[PDB]
Amino acid sequence: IDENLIKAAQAEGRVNSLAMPDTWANWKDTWADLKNLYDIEHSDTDMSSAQEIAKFKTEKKNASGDIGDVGASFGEIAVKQGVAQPFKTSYWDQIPTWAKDKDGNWLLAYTGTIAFIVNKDVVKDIPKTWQDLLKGNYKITVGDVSVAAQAVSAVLAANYALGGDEKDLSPALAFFNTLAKQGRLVNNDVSIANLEKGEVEVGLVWDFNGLGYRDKVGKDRYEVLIPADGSVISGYTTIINKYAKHPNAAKLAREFILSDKGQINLAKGYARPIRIDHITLPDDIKAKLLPSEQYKNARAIKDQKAWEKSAKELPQLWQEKVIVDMK
Ligand SMILES: NCCOP(=O)(O)OC[C@H](O)CO
Numbered sequence: 180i181d182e183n184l185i186k187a188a189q190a191e192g193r194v195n196s197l198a199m200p201d202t203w204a205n206w207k208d209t210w211a212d213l214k215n216l217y218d219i220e221h222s223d224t225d226m227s228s229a230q231e232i233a234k235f236k237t238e239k240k241n242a243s244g245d246i247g248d249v250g251a252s253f254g255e256i257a258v259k260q261g262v263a264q265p266f267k268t269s270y271w272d273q274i275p276t277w278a279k280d281k282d283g284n285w286l287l288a289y290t291g292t293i294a295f296i297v298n299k300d301v302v303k304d305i306p307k308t309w310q311d312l313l314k315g316n317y318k319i320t321v322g323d324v325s326v327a328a329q330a331v332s333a334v335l336a337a338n339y340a341l342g343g344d345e346k347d348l349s350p351a352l353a354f355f356n357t358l359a360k361q362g363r364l365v366n367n368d369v370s371i372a373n374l375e376k377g378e379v380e381v382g383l384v385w386d387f388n389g390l391g392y393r394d395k396v397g398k399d400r401y402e403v404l405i406p407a408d409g410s411v412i413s414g415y416t417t418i419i420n421k422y423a424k425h426p427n428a429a430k431l432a433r434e435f436i437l438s439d440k441g442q443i444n445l446a447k448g449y450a451r452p453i454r455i456d457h458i459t460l461p462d463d464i465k466a467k468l469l470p471s472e473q474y475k476n477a478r479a480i481k482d483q484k485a486w487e488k489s490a491k492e493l494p495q496l497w498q499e500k501v502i503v504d505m506k
Pocket residue numbers: 198199203225226227228229248249250326327328329330368369
């Protein structure tokens with residue numbers, strides 16, 4: 180890690196993040212490490228992907244945030260909105276071509292697979308597939324599709340299970356319209372608070388969040404599983420605000436996140452680090468992960484551009500085809 184970068188980051192003194200809370204994929208260990216290793220302070224303001232891009236845009240130079248983390252379908256939105264500045268990091272060549280742009284404005288640090296988190300007290304017949312969800316009477320916490328990458332991805336995951344792909348989300352929209360009409364949809368995100376209270380019945384979340392949240396709340400209260408009929412694998416990229424007040428500290432954070440230590444932190448949080456092939460993980464992680472068999476129909480996106488387009492159009496379709504029909 181370049182010494183002038185550490186020095187410039189320390190002169191700034193801190194890094195302000197958006198949507199990088201401690202409870203998400205063990206960002207906790209990473210912010211602790213920046214304080215403990217380079218004396219960089221930090222504070223975060225949680226939100227969803229779409230909101231992070233609008234905030235950097237709205238605030239300009241009087242930026243409340245320096246760095247954010249957004250879903251794979253939003254890297255290009257950040258770029259198109261002019262809120263991203265490039266920083267490839269010293270690990271650029273180990274990042275797969277499908278996981279980054281060409282200039283360094285966005286690059287996935289980790290990936291996950293859409294999963295179900297199920298309340299064992301309320302849901303007696305645990306759903307194992309997307310098809311199973313159509314027959315219960317319990318409430319499905321889908322995520323806020325208007326702004327969250329996790330929720331947008333959950334829709335694509337259902338779409339894959341219904342035999343579609345990232346070029347046309349119509350089958351999944353019909354599936355969610357069906358549930359909306361039954362009065363079984365909850366249009367908010369799963370959170371540790373709503374899991375603690377026992378309010379989530381079936382929730383749609385990344386496996387890493389399902390597992391992380393399960394530890395906080397109780398392993399015997401919630402089951403986490405990958406739907407057997409299909410799911411999506413996708414990931415997240417940091418975005419360094421073009422208008423960051425602390426650009427060097429943001430660059431330092433990104434560099435660290437991609438370093439062996441930041442990648443190990445992500446693994447301890449149950450996510451799959453993008454540089455998994457070049458790091459040695461601790462042996463204890465594997466046993467806390469889900470059975471491999473469950474991932475039998477989980478697939479990555481083949482056409483990034485088609486997904487970017489479908490995802491961008493999804494919020495309006497969600498309002499018009501799902502929200503408007505909620506019982
Ligand atoms: N964590 C980066 C933003 O992730 P995103 O999936 O866009 O939002 C999730 C929502 O904020 C509930 O946790």
